[PDB]
Amino acid sequence: GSRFVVEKNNLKVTSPDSIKGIYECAIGNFGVPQYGGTLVGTVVYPKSNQKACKSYSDFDISFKSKPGRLPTFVLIDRGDCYFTLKAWIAQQAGAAAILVADSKAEPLITMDTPEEDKSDADYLQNITIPSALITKTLGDSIKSALSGGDMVNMKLDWTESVPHP
Numbered sequence: 765g766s767r768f769v770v771e772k773n774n775l776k777v778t779s780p781d782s783i784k785g786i787y788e789c790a791i792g793n794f795g796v797p798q799y800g801g802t803l804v805g806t807v808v809y810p811k812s813n814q815k816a817c818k819s820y821s822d823f824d825i826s827f828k829s830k831p832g833r834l835p836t837f838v839l840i841d842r843g844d845c846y847f848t849l850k851a852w853i854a855q856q857a858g859a860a861a862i863l864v865a866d867s868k869a870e871p872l873i874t875m876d877t878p879e880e881d882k883s884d885a886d887y888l889q890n891i892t893i894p895s896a897l898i899t900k901t902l903g904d905s906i907k908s909a910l911s912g913g914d915m916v917n918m919k920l921d922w923t924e925s926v927p928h929p
Contacts, residue, residue: 765883768792768847768876768897773928775896778804779917783905789863790872790897791922794888795851800923803894805860806834807916809907817845820857828858835860837918839906842867846880848887851895861894861920865903872897894920 768790775789810816812823816838820826827836838859840850847864854862866875875897909916921928 765878765881766873766876767794767881767888768872770872774921775898776919776921776928777906777916778919780909780914782914783909783916787898787902788872789902789920790876791920792847792851792891792895792897794848795891795893795895796922800926802919802921802923803861804834804919805837805917807837807839807863807906807910807918809839809910814841815844816840816850816853816862817843819853826858827854827860829860834917837861837863837920839903840864841903842875842880846882847895847897848882848884848891851891851893852887855891855893859893861896863896863898863903863906865898865906866900869900872899894922896920 770790772788775787777783810825813820827838829836838854840862851862906916
């Protein structure tokens with residue numbers, strides 16, 4: 765299918781300054797309420813299981829945020845399994861949102877394949893977290909910032925057909 769809708773205005777990196785800006789993303793239509801909203805969080809790129817095709821419990825990895833601390837957006841690499849399985853697996857591990865970074869530098873629409881965007885309703889209708897495809901360029905920029913010791917904070921704004929501030 766194409767369940768991931770390419771939007772130019774829906775994803776904002778708020779920190780650090782080096783990568784701060786607004787980026788394109790493809791937001792899944794599932795996992796969000798049917799009304800407008802935003803989610804503010806901080807990005808984690810896991811040490812293992814980076815494609816989220818296995819249980820994070822096998823790795824003793826959890827994304828649950830401590831009370832009072834920003835919700836965790838998990839950065840996940842494209843490959844080996846379909847996108848809603850990645851979202852489901854990240855969700856079981858306590859992720860507040862998932863960003864799936866393309867393995868190729870290319871237009872986002874090309875990443876939404878029939879092989880990776882699957883119709884299974886058990887997965888689609890049980891995802892509760894925002895799920896977005898992002899470019900290799902953004903994925904690499906986020907990884908670079910994180911490796912340098914910076915927190916990467918982000919906002920996902922999904923309200924359709926209205927500009928975002």
